[PDB]
Design an enzyme around this catalytic site. Structure first.
Site, PDB file in Angstrom:
ATOM      1  CG  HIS A  84     -16.885  -9.651  32.517  1.00 25.43           C
ATOM      2  ND1 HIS A  84     -17.195  -9.839  31.187  1.00 25.43           N
ATOM      3  CD2 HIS A  84     -17.862 -10.270  33.221  1.00 25.43           C
ATOM      4  CE1 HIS A  84     -18.312 -10.535  31.091  1.00 25.43           C
ATOM      5  NE2 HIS A  84     -18.738 -10.811  32.311  1.00 25.43           N
ATOM      6  CD  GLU A  93     -28.705 -12.825  32.023  1.00 32.20           C
ATOM      7  OE1 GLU A  93     -28.895 -12.427  33.189  1.00 32.20           O
ATOM      8  OE2 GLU A  93     -27.598 -12.748  31.451  1.00 32.20           O
TER       9      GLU A  93
END
Length: 597
Positions: free
Chosen positions: A487, A357
């Site tokens: 997802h 990230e």
């Protein structure tokens, strides 16, 4: 002047107003995703719909402008990004129904609780609990309880909603002049009309198929090894030669096999390089993890992070009082502020995710000087690739000894390399086939090759022949097991991660060659190599101003995704792993299952 200068002024005033509106809409979405309520659902929805309506009216105003007047290719890219009829093509009632379906699925996944009767009353969440249960438990019935619970009490909720979602998205994409919604996802990877750099989407699915077929041997060998180890640790539940049940993969669906490391360590008589114990005994927290990430990025030459990043990031779990989506995420909200959504635990998986990230944030920070329509990475694959370049460069034992987190007298031997590589292979080569199979199912179900009920049957069959993973209890057509993944239930693309792996390995190879690292690639650390960071900075400051193939060749020198660096990574592994399974059956029969007898 002519319409070209008018289009330039159009782009200028667009980018201004779109910067403002995007900052507001991103704020709304962020406050939804960290402070989930109903007021936040309404705020996110109305802000997003207003932004989409503004974007669609600007898109029509740009559709007034033929592209044949373009001299500057960047301008062509901006207007082509503005030339969409867009998902707003659907009727307002139809669009609202689709959005309702999407939101309902999102909340059912991120907040729907498990109340299973196999343990007759058991109710819990996905975050610590079900994930921790599937990650830390080594007993069959507990894993079966967790798995069957999440599949039959949460997938059955999403079966009708996923059916409606499939129909609406497919018809909307056919309205957008696409074959299906998988067509939209693939056409995200388009490159059009650049001096022989063009790239279609059928060529993309062909390339994914080719690379997977080339990979398959390594994953097959790693499968055989982990199956032998599981059958050694689970006496009477893994039948001899065939596949193994789905709940025995150290992860809820079987996406990551890193947890199985605890069960599948090849040489346990050596110091652990999967250092969770070292972190907790060093009194490590999320903030120090993130700050060491910042130190790594400073040492590789990239500038230090923004103060607003420290002030406004959700660096830890907000708590159980509010149900924030804890799947790690990285956010641009525009105007110069950047965020990370990390429910950070003290674990190698969370350390690597934090580095991922932070690489996302650095990617976001470098191209922020670009105009709005190109203020996005060359691909999702490139963002994730940068993140996992950082992750791979971190995990080296030399780096671990650099901060002194690993004992300075630690000895680097053959067994240490084997341990490192087996962990890395577990992770990456367990994601690869799962992602390929999952998006193959999604692609071919969107295209419509499967009758609706047959959905379920088909799904399981392909796992049994692609991921080599089966179910222990029958699941007829009324279930919806794919939706059990994040997802799938949040309208994301999963081949993004396959391209992530391949791109990150090519970039690591090229960047280590640039860093002039002497030795094998799998111990290369690009830290303290400011010129390598400068090269990476050039690539991820290029942004979307140029086709992603151009940046690919700028870093490595290839016009496509290649599998060669990945196989160059796990070569000593492949040797050792073949040496161990010399007396084992590498492979599984398709009709062969402990359930599907």
């Amino acid at each position: 002047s002519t319409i070209e200068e008018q289009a330039k002024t159009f782009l200028d005033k667009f980018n201004h107003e779109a910067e403002d509106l995007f900052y507001q809409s991103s704020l709304a979405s962020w406050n939804y995703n960290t402070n989930i309520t109903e007021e936040n659902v309404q705020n996110m929805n109305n802000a997003g719909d207003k932004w989409s309506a503004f974007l669609k009216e600007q898109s029509t105003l740009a559709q007034m402008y033929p592209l044949q007047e373009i001299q500057n290719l960047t301008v062509k890219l901006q207007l082509q990004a503005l030339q969409q009829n867009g998902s707003s093509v659907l009727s307002e009632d139809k669009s609202k129904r689709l959005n309702t379906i999407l939101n309902t699925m999102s909340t059912i996944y991120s907040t729907g609780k498990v109340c299973n009767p196999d343990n007759p009353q058991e109710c819990l969440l996905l975050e610590p609990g079900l994930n921790e249960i599937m990650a830390n438990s080594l007993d069959y019935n507990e894993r079966l309880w967790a798995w069957e619970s999440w599949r039959s009490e949460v997938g059955k909720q999403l079966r009708p909603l996923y059916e409606e979602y499939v129909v609406l998205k497919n018809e909307m994409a056919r309205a957008n002049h696409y074959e299906d919604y998988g067509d939209y996802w693939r056409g995200d990877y388009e490159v059009n009309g650049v001096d022989g750099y063009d790239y279609s989407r059928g060529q993309l699915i062909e390339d994914v198929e080719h690379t997977f077929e080339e990979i398959k041997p390594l994953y097959e060998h790693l499968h055989a090894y982990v199956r032998a180890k599981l059958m050694n640790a689970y006496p009477s539940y893994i039948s001899p030669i065939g596949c193994l049940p789905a709940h025995l993969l150290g992860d809820m669906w079987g996406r990551f096999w890193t947890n199985l490391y605890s069960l599948t360590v090849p040489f346990g008589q050596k110091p652990n390089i999967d250092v969770t114990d070292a972190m907790v005994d060093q009194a490590w927290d999320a903030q120090r993890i993130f700050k060491e990430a910042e130190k790594f990025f400073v040492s590789v030459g990239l500038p230090n992070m923004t103060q607003g990043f420290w002030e406004n990031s959700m660096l830890t779990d907000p708590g159980n009082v509010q149900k924030a989506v804890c799947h790690p995420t990285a956010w641009d909200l525009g105007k110069g502020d950047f965020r990370i959504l990390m429910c950070t635990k003290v674990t190698m998986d969370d350390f690597l995710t934090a580095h991922h990230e932070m690489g996302h944030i650095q990617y976001d920070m470098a191209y922020a000087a670009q105009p709005f329509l190109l203020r996005n990475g060359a691909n999702e694959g490139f963002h994730e690739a940068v993140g996992e370049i950082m992750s791979l460069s971190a995990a080296t034992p030399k780096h671990l000894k650099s901060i002194g987190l690993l004992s300075p007298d630690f000895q680097e031997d053959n067994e240490t390399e084997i341990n490192f590589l087996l962990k890395q292979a577990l992770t990456i080569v367990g994601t690869l086939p799962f992602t390929y199979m999952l998006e193959k199912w999604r692609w071919m179900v969107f295209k419509g090759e499967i009758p609706k009920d047959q959905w379920m049957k088909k799904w399981w069959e392909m796992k049994r022949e692609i991921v080599g993973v089966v179910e222990p209890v029958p699941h007829d057509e009324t279930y919806c097991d794919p939706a059990s993944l994040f997802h799938v239930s949040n309208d994301y693309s999963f081949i993004r991660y396959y391209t992530r792996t391949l791109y990150q390995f090519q970039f690591q190879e090229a960047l280590c060659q640039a860093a002039k690292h002497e030795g094998p690639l799998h111990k290369c650390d690009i830290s303290n190599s400011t010129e390598a960071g400068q090269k990476l900075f050039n690539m991820l400051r290029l942004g979307k101003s140029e086709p992603w193939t151009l940046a690919l060749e700028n870093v490595v020198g290839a016009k496509n995704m290649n599998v060669r660096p990945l196989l160059n990574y796990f070569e000593p592994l492949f040797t050792w792993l073949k040496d161990q399974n010399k007396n084992s059956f590498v492979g599984w029969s398709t009709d062969w299952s402990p359930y599907a007898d």
